[PDB]
Amino acid sequence: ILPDSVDWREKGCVTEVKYQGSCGASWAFSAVGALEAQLKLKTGKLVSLSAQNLVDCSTEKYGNKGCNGGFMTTAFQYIIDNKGIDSDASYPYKAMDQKCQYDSKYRAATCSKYTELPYGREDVLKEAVANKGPVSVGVDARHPSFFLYRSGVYYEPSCTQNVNHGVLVVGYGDLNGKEYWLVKNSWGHNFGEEGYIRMARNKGNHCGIASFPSYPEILQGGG
Numbered sequence: 227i228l229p230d231s232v233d234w235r236e237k238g239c240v241t242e243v244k245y246q247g248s249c250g251a252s253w254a255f256s257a258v259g260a261l262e263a264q265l266k267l268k269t270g271k272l273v274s275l276s277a278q279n280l281v282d283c284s285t286e287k288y289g290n291k292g293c294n295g296g297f298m299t300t301a302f303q304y305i306i307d308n309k310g311i312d313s314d315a316s317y318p319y320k321a322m323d324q325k326c327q328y329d330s331k332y333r334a335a336t337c338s339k340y341t342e343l344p345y346g347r348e349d350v351l352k353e354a355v356a357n358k359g360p361v362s363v364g365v366d367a368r369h370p371s372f373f374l375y376r377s378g379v380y381y382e383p384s385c386t387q388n389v390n391h392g393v394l395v396v397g398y399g400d401l402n403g404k405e406y407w408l409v410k411n412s413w414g415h416n417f418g419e420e421g422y423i424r425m426a427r428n429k430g431n432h433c434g435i436a437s438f439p440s441y442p443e444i445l446q447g448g449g
C-alpha cells in the first residue's frame with residue numbers, strides 16, 4: 227500500500243525554501259507550502275503563494291497574530307472564506323505586519339476545504355503524506371538542539387507534544403534504519419540540510435509532529 231519512502235520534491239510539488247527572518251510567520255509558510263503542492267498536483271503549475279497575504283489578511287477572525295504567530299488550519303479557512311490567495315510574486319514577503327492588500331486579480335490558488343488529522347497518529351500522518359500530499363504540522367521547536375540541527379535524524383529527549391512552530395511534512399523515510407519525517411522549514415537554506423530537517427518518526431509523537439496536522443484540498447467538482 228504505502229511506499230517505504232516519500233519525497234514530494236521528486237514530483238516537483240515543493241517550492242524553494244523561504245526565509246522568514248524577524249517575523250513569527252512559520253504558520254503562514256507552512257500553510258502556503260501545503261497549498262502550493264495541491265496547486266501543482268491539480269494544475270501542473272508550481273508557484274510560491276503569498277505568506278504575506280496570510281500575515282496581513284488572516285487576522286483576528288482566524289485567531290492569528292501576524293508576525294506574532296498563528297495557525298495553519300485557520301489560515302486555510304481564510305483562503306476558503308476569501309475565495310483565494312495571491313501569488314508570492316504579486317504579494318511579496320516583507321517579514322512585518324501590513325495592512326491587508328489582497329487583490330483578486332493576482333489570485334493564484336483557492337481552497338475548497340481542509341482536513342485535520344487525529345492527534346498523535348503517525349500512521350494516519352504517513353498515509354496522508356503518501357496519498358494526499360505534504361501536510362502542515364506544528365512541532366515543539368523550543369529546544370536549542372532544534373536551532374543547531376545540521377544533519378541526521380533529529381531526536382530531542384526534552385521535546386514535548388506541545389507545538390509552537392509551523393513546518394511542512396513533504397515526505398518520510400529511514401536513514402540507515404532511523405525512521406524520519408522529511409520536514410521543510412522556513413528559516414532559509416542555512417538551516418539544517420538546505421532548509422530541511424529529518425525529524426524522528428514513530429517515536430511517540432516526537433516533538434508533537436503529529437499533534438495538529440492538517441492539509442488543504444482543491445476539489446475537482448464532486449458527486
Ligand SMILES: CS(=O)(=O)N1CCc2c(c(-c3ccc(Cl)c(C#Cc4ccc5c(c4)CN[C@H](C(=O)N4CCCCC4)C5)c3)nn2CCCN2CCOCC2)C1
Pocket residue numbers: 248249250251252253288289293294295296297298300363364365387388389390391392393437438
Ligand atoms: C499549546 S498546544 O500545543 O497544546 N496547542 C493548543 C491547541 C492547538 C495548537 C495548535 C497549533 C498547531 C500548529 C502550530 Cl504551527 C501552532 C503554532 C504556533 C506558533 C507559530 C508562531 C509563533 C508562535 C506560535 C508563538 N509566537 C511566536 C512569536 O511571536 N515570535 C516572535 C519573535 C521571533 C519569532 C517568534 C511565533 C499551533 N493548533 N491547536 C488546535 C487548534 C487551536 N485553535 C486554533 C484557532 O484559534 C483557537 C485555537 C497548539
